[PDB]
Write an enzyme that holds these catalytic residues in place. Structure first.
Site, PDB file in Angstrom:
ATOM      1  N   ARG A  13       1.762 -12.182 -11.228  1.00  0.00           N
ATOM      2  CA  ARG A  13       0.593 -11.156 -11.498  1.00  0.00           C
ATOM      3  C   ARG A  13       0.854  -9.791 -11.503  1.00  0.00           C
ATOM      4  O   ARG A  13       1.738  -9.297 -12.263  1.00  0.00           O
ATOM      5  CB  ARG A  13      -0.488 -11.390 -10.399  1.00  0.00           C
ATOM      6  CG  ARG A  13      -1.311 -12.745 -10.395  1.00  0.00           C
ATOM      7  CD  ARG A  13      -1.660 -13.136  -9.068  1.00  0.00           C
ATOM      8  NE  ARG A  13      -2.895 -12.377  -8.701  1.00  0.00           N
ATOM      9  CZ  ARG A  13      -4.062 -12.514  -9.221  1.00  0.00           C
ATOM     10  NH1 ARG A  13      -4.017 -13.191 -10.451  1.00  0.00           N
ATOM     11  NH2 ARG A  13      -5.185 -11.725  -8.804  1.00  0.00           N
ATOM     12  N   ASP A 157      -6.761  -0.555  -2.956  1.00  0.00           N
ATOM     13  CA  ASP A 157      -7.967  -1.321  -3.479  1.00  0.00           C
ATOM     14  C   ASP A 157      -8.883   0.065  -3.881  1.00  0.00           C
ATOM     15  O   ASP A 157      -9.283   0.359  -2.833  1.00  0.00           O
ATOM     16  CB  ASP A 157      -8.338  -2.126  -2.464  1.00  0.00           C
ATOM     17  CG  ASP A 157      -9.413  -3.317  -2.929  1.00  0.00           C
ATOM     18  OD1 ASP A 157     -10.194  -2.662  -3.854  1.00  0.00           O
ATOM     19  OD2 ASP A 157      -9.381  -4.312  -2.592  1.00  0.00           O
ATOM     20  N   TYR A 170      -8.269  -7.167   6.009  1.00  0.00           N
ATOM     21  CA  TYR A 170      -7.696  -6.702   4.729  1.00  0.00           C
ATOM     22  C   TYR A 170      -8.394  -5.346   4.399  1.00  0.00           C
ATOM     23  O   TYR A 170      -7.225  -4.541   4.209  1.00  0.00           O
ATOM     24  CB  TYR A 170      -8.463  -7.662   3.453  1.00  0.00           C
ATOM     25  CG  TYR A 170      -7.939  -7.192   1.960  1.00  0.00           C
ATOM     26  CD1 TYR A 170      -6.601  -7.398   1.754  1.00  0.00           C
ATOM     27  CD2 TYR A 170      -9.037  -6.421   1.517  1.00  0.00           C
ATOM     28  CE1 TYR A 170      -6.458  -6.907   0.375  1.00  0.00           C
ATOM     29  CE2 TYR A 170      -8.856  -5.872   0.263  1.00  0.00           C
ATOM     30  CZ  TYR A 170      -7.622  -6.021  -0.411  1.00  0.00           C
ATOM     31  OH  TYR A 170      -7.523  -5.585  -1.467  1.00  0.00           O
TER      32      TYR A 170
HETATM   33  N1  LIG Z   1      -5.959  -8.183  -8.549  1.00  0.00           N
HETATM   34  C1  LIG Z   1      -6.795  -7.522  -7.987  1.00  0.00           C
HETATM   35  O1  LIG Z   1      -7.901  -7.408  -8.748  1.00  0.00           O
HETATM   36  C2  LIG Z   1      -6.473  -6.464  -6.828  1.00  0.00           C
HETATM   37  C3  LIG Z   1      -5.284  -6.016  -6.423  1.00  0.00           C
HETATM   38  N2  LIG Z   1      -5.223  -5.383  -5.310  1.00  0.00           N
HETATM   39  C4  LIG Z   1      -3.684  -5.013  -4.887  1.00  0.00           C
HETATM   40  O2  LIG Z   1      -2.842  -4.742  -5.870  1.00  0.00           O
HETATM   41  C5  LIG Z   1      -1.447  -5.500  -5.373  1.00  0.00           C
HETATM   42  C6  LIG Z   1      -1.247  -6.413  -6.540  1.00  0.00           C
HETATM   43  O3  LIG Z   1      -2.284  -7.358  -6.842  1.00  0.00           O
HETATM   44  P1  LIG Z   1      -2.201  -8.838  -7.085  1.00  0.00           P
HETATM   45  O4  LIG Z   1      -1.098  -9.258  -8.164  1.00  0.00           O
HETATM   46  O5  LIG Z   1      -3.437  -9.503  -7.411  1.00  0.00           O
HETATM   47  O6  LIG Z   1      -1.856  -9.612  -5.752  1.00  0.00           O
HETATM   48  P2  LIG Z   1      -1.665 -11.129  -5.207  1.00  0.00           P
HETATM   49  O7  LIG Z   1      -2.715 -11.551  -4.380  1.00  0.00           O
HETATM   50  O8  LIG Z   1      -1.273 -12.036  -6.460  1.00  0.00           O
HETATM   51  O9  LIG Z   1      -0.273 -10.939  -4.532  1.00  0.00           O
HETATM   52  C7  LIG Z   1       1.002 -10.559  -4.839  1.00  0.00           C
HETATM   53  C8  LIG Z   1       1.973 -11.065  -3.753  1.00  0.00           C
HETATM   54  O10 LIG Z   1       2.019 -10.586  -2.427  1.00  0.00           O
HETATM   55  C9  LIG Z   1       2.953 -11.408  -1.790  1.00  0.00           C
HETATM   56  N3  LIG Z   1       2.682 -11.688  -0.417  1.00  0.00           N
HETATM   57  C10 LIG Z   1       1.701 -11.899   0.244  1.00  0.00           C
HETATM   58  N4  LIG Z   1       1.559 -12.032   1.475  1.00  0.00           N
HETATM   59  C11 LIG Z   1       2.836 -11.862   1.860  1.00  0.00           C
HETATM   60  C12 LIG Z   1       3.826 -11.706   3.046  1.00  0.00           C
HETATM   61  N5  LIG Z   1       2.967 -12.005   4.248  1.00  0.00           N
HETATM   62  N6  LIG Z   1       5.152 -11.312   2.997  1.00  0.00           N
HETATM   63  C13 LIG Z   1       5.596 -11.224   1.832  1.00  0.00           C
HETATM   64  N7  LIG Z   1       4.796 -11.151   0.625  1.00  0.00           N
HETATM   65  C14 LIG Z   1       3.578 -11.593   0.558  1.00  0.00           C
HETATM   66  C15 LIG Z   1       2.821 -12.778  -2.584  1.00  0.00           C
HETATM   67  O11 LIG Z   1       4.325 -13.082  -2.625  1.00  0.00           O
HETATM   68  P3  LIG Z   1       4.656 -14.789  -2.945  1.00  0.00           P
HETATM   69  O12 LIG Z   1       3.798 -15.289  -4.077  1.00  0.00           O
HETATM   70  O13 LIG Z   1       6.335 -14.465  -3.215  1.00  0.00           O
HETATM   71  O14 LIG Z   1       4.534 -15.526  -1.680  1.00  0.00           O
HETATM   72  C16 LIG Z   1       2.128 -12.652  -3.715  1.00  0.00           C
HETATM   73  O15 LIG Z   1       2.658 -13.143  -5.146  1.00  0.00           O
HETATM   74  C17 LIG Z   1      -1.835  -6.083  -4.286  1.00  0.00           C
HETATM   75  O16 LIG Z   1      -1.364  -4.930  -3.044  1.00  0.00           O
HETATM   76  C18 LIG Z   1      -3.556  -6.174  -3.959  1.00  0.00           C
HETATM   77  O17 LIG Z   1      -3.796  -6.069  -2.685  1.00  0.00           O
HETATM   78  C19 LIG Z   1      -6.349  -4.758  -4.993  1.00  0.00           C
HETATM   79  C20 LIG Z   1      -7.442  -4.824  -5.535  1.00  0.00           C
HETATM   80  C21 LIG Z   1      -7.843  -5.682  -6.514  1.00  0.00           C
END
Ligand SMILES: NC(=O)C1=CN([C@@H]2O[C@H](COP(=O)(O)OP(=O)(O)OC[C@H]3O[C@@H](n4cnc5c(N)ncnc54)[C@H](OP(=O)(O)O)[C@@H]3O)[C@@H](O)[C@H]2O)C=CC1
Ligand SMILES: NC(=O)C1=CN([C@@H]2O[C@H](COP(=O)(O)OP(=O)(O)OC[C@H]3O[C@@H](n4cnc5c(N)ncnc54)[C@H](OP(=O)(O)O)[C@@H]3O)[C@@H](O)[C@H]2O)C=CC1
Ligand SMILES: NC(=O)C1=CN([C@@H]2O[C@H](COP(=O)(O)OP(=O)(O)OC[C@H]3O[C@@H](n4cnc5c(N)ncnc54)[C@H](OP(=O)(O)O)[C@@H]3O)[C@@H](O)[C@H]2O)C=CC1
Ligand SMILES: NC(=O)C1=CN([C@@H]2O[C@H](COP(=O)(O)OP(=O)(O)OC[C@H]3O[C@@H](n4cnc5c(N)ncnc54)[C@H](OP(=O)(O)O)[C@@H]3O)[C@@H](O)[C@H]2O)C=CC1
Ligand SMILES: O=C1C[C@H](c2cccc(O)c2)Oc2ccc(O)cc21
Ligand SMILES: O=C1C[C@H](c2cccc(O)c2)Oc2ccc(O)cc21
Lengths: 264, 254, 254, 265
Positions: A13, A157, A170
């Site tokens: 993503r 966010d 969150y």
């Molecule tokens: N998509 C959206 O609409 C929105 C996104 N955001 C923020 O933008 C950023 C990127 O978004 P997006 O690509 O959707 O995020 P995702 O929900 O796809 O999360 C990205 C990655 O975070 C990693 N992750 C989750 N938990 C842990 C942990 N405990 N330790 C280490 N790694 C972890 C995962 O790694 P792995 O897969 O390697 O396990 C996952 O691939 C994020 O910070 C999100 O909060 C904010 C608002 C809206």
């Protein structure tokens, strides 16, 4: 000679797209991942084929829990930054992108304590430890050897001021990340390390519910009536990391197609 | 073909830097000025020498007053600015509300009615009319002839939540402009017209030591590059937002 | 000794409720009105029947226009409103900028009237009124000054999530927010507190079911109690802040 | 029908002032404390002598750590505080999240680092979260006809954390989470008619452990009065937000800072 970016949650993503955008600007990218080993190695392979020795992968759980002496979160974060310096001798850009996201309703066992540590660790506490470790390294570098464009981005966010029902930890975790952006920008200004936030609204909206519901939820975005592409966020991150953004620090850029201007 | 930018207060300082930034991306630029005809015409000469027919200049007082030729209202002058772009190049893709008067209106010790019209017009009322004229023209263009990247940038201030002592009318008009950015972004979303803010803190001063980042005011490019980025297609999902370019100055407290 | 409150748009609804609440606390109230002469006077009579010499009414158009005598400017009209408190009771302790026109100014398919009306009542008249109130206080010798000066600006809880088609209005409230911050800083040496109160949905005439708390709009008292509290000596450390009274409505998202 | 208020860190300064102002309005008060046993017991004795059986004290570390008995989690100690109100008086109408640790966590120069995070984040953010959860569960588990008519939660946040204090990142981060808690709990607890608000002091009862010029220097920067506030100048605002006149205010933050946040360097 070539600048270095550490990207957390780089595998898929927005993380992948940020990693690619920086890579396309000539950064070597350290690809952090937790679960998604296969996607991270595939992405590393693609980037290394494009430019040899331009990517590595490092695994770390960013939950605020001790692992595998038990190893602390702080240590694991220090070790992430250290992988950059070990392999390439520098770390110029840090993108705190990794993030857990799931309900913690206030209205109804060890799923409680693992939730707080997971949601707080990934969204807030690990970013703190990462920034600290990144800054210690810069501090420890003789001024004559310092990079000339240090930049840290936190993915926050756009919508946490209109909180998503049932997502309190969150929402609080992102609130904390916002604080981090403002406190680190202040303290790290003497070292010219810039710290900023980028806040997606709806980006690459997960397709895991009926089409009417998914199309319902995208159509609420005023601009285009859709969720963003990953590049529509990541290009903003690459712009904030660029020398053209060198007077920006401590600010948040919303990337949300005007979703935060809405009301129920 | 060639996209067009209207930049108000284009003759000097940030406005000139923004007009130069946009021109370097390939925009034709309409250079609005009020009193700075010499400086605005020299800038036009420079840009036209670089690329033939890529700049023009237009004069308007953006104060909320009537001017002589039936007297001409602020609204009419604002419509005529946007029209000048259409008349000359057949389009107006980008609008930058940059023109701004800035001087004291103290609350504590006639032509305080001048301040109101001048400070409120340039900073808030003229931008409203310009946005309105801009939007009418896009809405009036058959959809298949519309550009693909309509972008409006309001120059606001990073520091107005920490008001400058004695600058109440200026501070108010910036607050009005911030509201214009949010309300215009929402209402113009369906025509794909993006509306955003860029807030300088301390820029090209003619207190520097208080700015956490570098302990200086910014260059004009340090601001205008941000403007250019927000207008580019890479920024197409950004609307209704405001980018501080202040080197961390708004993080400070006395 | 009896403190005095000046309440703009005091005839009905929130203005009335604020005027009553102030009066209930023992204030003499100056009840400003524009077109509601009957209701202002009927209110005055009730409050004068409760305590003699505790209410008066004053008419003024708060639009940013000249009226009939040279013509009378908005500044003169605002200064005279404050002069009425001093002329009748020798003081003015509390100012509530409550009067507010509210109606569409669409960006997409009289423009001068909207501009003058919505900006004047919402922003420029509050400016002039604050300036007149403050000049009076500064011109009072220190030993003779009140001990609890309070300005309340009625803003809107929902203007960050703008109502579609209401641009001039939303800009005017944003200007008023800036007035709150700038006047609070400038007037702090004279111990004049300046604060905002942001109603959400209040005494509507089907957005109501969307309010998280109670799924209704507020009563008038639900807002005016807040205003009374902010004017009280218990609120003497509060200045430059804005209190939302919106039942959590600003927390929502489409 | 005597309403009950839980006040964390109630033993001194703003907490004590809040606990008094609530007591003065007719509340029974449960006064939480951690290390300040003697001050807490003294204040309890004072309020019990004004109105018998209208104060109790409970002790809890609100740090995000397990404690001495299985080990006892923070979650449990928090549920146990709200429990103490139900056990003793059969109700809990008002919760004031006031307890807060505050000390530097510099980014620039290690059992110190672990313990700071758990303490700063526990006291300012995670404890409030669990306290809120426990307070809401009780209300949800009370049949509607027996519910109080004015539930109110106040979080003590900080007027000044958008202009961060150099060297205090975890604190600033915790206050940021606490603001998130206000907004989120207000929305989610609205159906139970549980209002959640923030009160953000600026400089309030400023400790004088620097040279006089430093203390007087700090205070002089406050635009209104050129002084820090009294405890009462904050607590009166807390009391108002808990009162039935504030019954339509939820999810908002009120700064009590004498204009300090309006300033710039
Ligand atoms: N998509 C959206 O609409 C929105 C996104 N955001 C923020 O933008 C950023 C990127 O978004 P997006 O690509 O959707 O995020 P995702 O929900 O796809 O999360 C990205 C990655 O975070 C990693 N992750 C989750 N938990 C842990 C942990 N405990 N330790 C280490 N790694 C972890 C995962 O790694 P792995 O897969 O390697 O396990 C996952 O691939 C994020 O910070 C999100 O909060 C904010 C608002 C809206
Ligand atoms: N530089 C800084 O430190 C800061 C700048 N800003 C904002 O950034 C923008 C540009 O800043 P800066 O370059 O310093 O601005 P300037 O003060 O140099 O103003 C730019 C131009 O606005 C025009 N102008 C002023 N009043 C009127 C009027 N009544 N009618 C028409 N035009 C008018 C003038 O044009 P002419 O010369 O043709 O008469 C002037 O050259 C402004 O909107 C400002 O508010 C905000 C905070 C700090
Ligand atoms: N009620 C609500 O839901 C909301 C209210 N607010 C704000 O709260 C405040 C009070 O709300 P509410 O009681 O509903 O206000 P109203 O819309 O009922 O109007 C209040 C008074 O303003 C006066 N007024 C309007 N235009 C002018 C003018 N040009 N000159 C002089 N006076 C004028 C009118 O006086 P007259 O009748 O004598 O002519 C009117 O009775 C306002 O500032 C408003 O914007 C904000 C958000 C929501
Ligand atoms: N005073 C000011 O100028 C400002 C105050 N505030 C906020 O207002 C609130 C009250 O301010 P103030 O009176 O100065 O507060 P104090 O700093 O005096 O601390 C309040 C109480 O919190 C308790 N506490 C601290 N850490 C813990 C912990 N880990 N577990 C349980 N209890 C703990 C202490 O209890 P005990 O003594 O029992 O150990 C202490 O008495 C705080 O939340 C503060 O952050 C915000 C900005 C400025
Ligand atoms: O020249 C400036 C600096 C000036 C300034 C000067 C000093 C402090 C501060 O916050 C701002 O801000 C401006 C605002 C509008 C404008 O058109 C020009 C300027
Ligand atoms: O009567 C209203 C409600 C009205 C309203 C109606 C519907 C949605 C919304 O955000 C606001 O807001 C007002 C603003 C100014 C004013 O003088 C009166 C009103």
């Amino acid at each position: 000679t070539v600048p270095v970016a550490l990207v957390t949650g780089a595998a898929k993503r927005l993380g992948r797209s940020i990693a690619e955008g920086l890579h396309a600007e000539g950064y070597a990218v350290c690809l952090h991942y937790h679960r998604s080993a296969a996607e991270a190695n595939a992405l590393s392979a693609t980037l290394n084929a494009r430019r040899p020795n331009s990517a590595i992968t490092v695994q770390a759980d960013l939950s605020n829990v001790a692992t595998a002496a038990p190893v602390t979160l702080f240590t694991r974060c220090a070790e992430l930054v250290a992988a950059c310096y070990t392999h390439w001798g520098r770390c110029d850009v840090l993108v705190n992108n990794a993030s857990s996201f799931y309900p913690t309703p206030l209205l109804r066992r060890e799923a409680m304590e693992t939730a707080t540590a997971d949601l707080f660790g990934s969204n807030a506490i690990a970013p703190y430890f990462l920034i600290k470790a990144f800054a210690h390294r810069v501090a420890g570098t003789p001024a004559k050897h310092r990079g000339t464009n240090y930049s840290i981005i936190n993915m926050v966010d756009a919508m946490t001021n209109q909180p998503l029902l049932g997502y309190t930890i969150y929402t609080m975790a992102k609130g904390a990340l916002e604080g981090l952006t403002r406190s680190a920008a202040l303290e790290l200004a003497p070292l010219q390390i810039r710290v900023n936030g980028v806040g997606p609204g709806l980006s690459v909206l997960v397709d895991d519910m009926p089409p009417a519901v998914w199309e319902g939820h995208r159509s609420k975005v005023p601009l285009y009536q859709r969720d963003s592409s990953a590049a529509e966020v990541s290009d903003v991150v690459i712009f904030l990391c660029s020398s053209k953004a060198k007077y920006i620090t401590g600010t948040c850029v919303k990337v949300d197609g005007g979703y935060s201007l809405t009301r129920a």
